[PDB]
Ligand binder design. Structure first.
Ligand SMILES: *C/C=C1/C(=C/c2[nH]c(/C=C3[NH+]=C(/C=C4\NC(=O)C(C=C)=C4C)C(C)=C\3CCC(=O)O)c(CCC(=O)O)c2C)NC(=O)[C@H]1C
Length: 311
């Protein structure tokens, strides 16, 4: 059973209670983007990341309480029709914005209950179809693993891309990797289950991609921290901008990893493994490339089942 989050008087997490961290409700985001929450009916902005005003070039006093009708006149009607009350929380509305203060922005919106969760990130399929085909054309499980890591590395430029496979006891093993010259091998190395604790593995079965763009960057809180609709935490399990567990951030820093990203491989409704990526320098993977990775994760998941059937 989860501890209360830090902003509800909960304790800072230690190695004695890894699995009790409520990672889905950190009440804060990573600073490379901005997040707003809004009422699902009225479009009233209910919460904003502390950096939202500066990030969007808006006046802090104007942004809170303002409506999505006023802030996003060209998207609001499309947004409403796309995400009606009761829709699956995995369902997304995406748009590209031309925003003077921040340049081209990717907007990603989801609904949870009566709340809309809006993520703004800077933004800039021939390669995708080729990548899809390379996975399918892979002859066996090992080659599929190898092609997957190589293809993901080519698409992303990440210093290391691993296929990290979970054993029945939830320990992990790197079973394939593609790596930059000079990086030491993790191939064949195994890791305790506690390195990716049970509540993370659970979240990763439902929300299939997560990342930390800068492992040294302080989280940016949401204000107000609680959803005013409910006087309860804002569900951020489906927000890629959500803050990463400090326990994990520390693990990455100690490994010399500045940027981390993984994609779930789900086989038969169970978490089979992860496409796990590292960069030494902080690194924001373009929003369009993340969508490509999401498609490739789905393809790999299908192909792992197919290839395991071949034996
Ligand atoms: C006491 C808690 C601990 C803890 C928590 C923790 N770890 C994660 C997430 C991940 N851990 C990963 C581990 C590895 N990455 C690697 O490259 C290797 C080995 C080469 C390992 C073992 C991975 C891949 C993740 C997924 C996230 C990612 O891809 O960056 C979480 C959940 C983080 C979040 O989503 O907010 C948590 C709470 N890890 C520990 O070691 C202990 C201290």
């Amino acid at each position: 059973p989860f501890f209360p989050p830090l902003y509800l008087g909960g304790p800072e997490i230690t190695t004695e209670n890894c699995e009790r961290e409520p990672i889905h409700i950190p009440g804060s985001i990573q600073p490379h983007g901005a997040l707003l929450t809004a009422d699902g009916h009225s479009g009233e902005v209910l919460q904003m990341s502390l950096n939202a005003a500066t990030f969007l070039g808006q006046e802090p006093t104007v942004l809170r309480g303002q409506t999505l009708a006023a802030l996003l006149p060209e998207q609001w009607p499309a947004l409403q029709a796309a995400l009606p009350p009761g829709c699956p929380d995995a369902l997304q509305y995406r748009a590209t914005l031309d925003w003077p203060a921040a340049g081209h922005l990717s907007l990603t919106v989801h609904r949870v209950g009566e709340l809309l969760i809006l993520e703004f990130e800077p933004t800039e399929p021939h390669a995708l179809r080729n990548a899809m085909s390379a996975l399918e054309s892979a002859p066996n499980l090992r080659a599929l693993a190898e092609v997957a890591t190589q293809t993901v590395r080519e698409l992303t430029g990440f210093d290391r891309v691993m296929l990290y496979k979970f054993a029945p006891d939830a320990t992990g093993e790197v079973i394939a990797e593609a790596r930059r010259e000079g990086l030491h091998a993790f191939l064949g190395h195994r890791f305790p289950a506690s390195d990716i604790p049970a509540q993370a593995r659970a979240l990763y079965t439902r929300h299939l991609l997560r990342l930390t763009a800068d492992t040294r960057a302080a989280a940016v809180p949401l204000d107000p921290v609680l959803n005013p609709q409910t006087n309860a935490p804002t569900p951020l399990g489906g927000a890629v901008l959500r803050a990463t567990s400090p326990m994990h951030m520390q693990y990455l820093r100690n490994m010399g990893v500045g940027s981390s990203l993984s994609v779930s491989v789900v086989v038969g409704g169970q978490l089979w493994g992860l496409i796990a990526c590292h960069h030494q320098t902080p690194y924001v993977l373009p929003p369009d490339l993340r969508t490509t990775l999401e498609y490739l994760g789905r393809e790999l998941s299908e192909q792992v089942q197919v290839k395991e059937a071949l034996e």
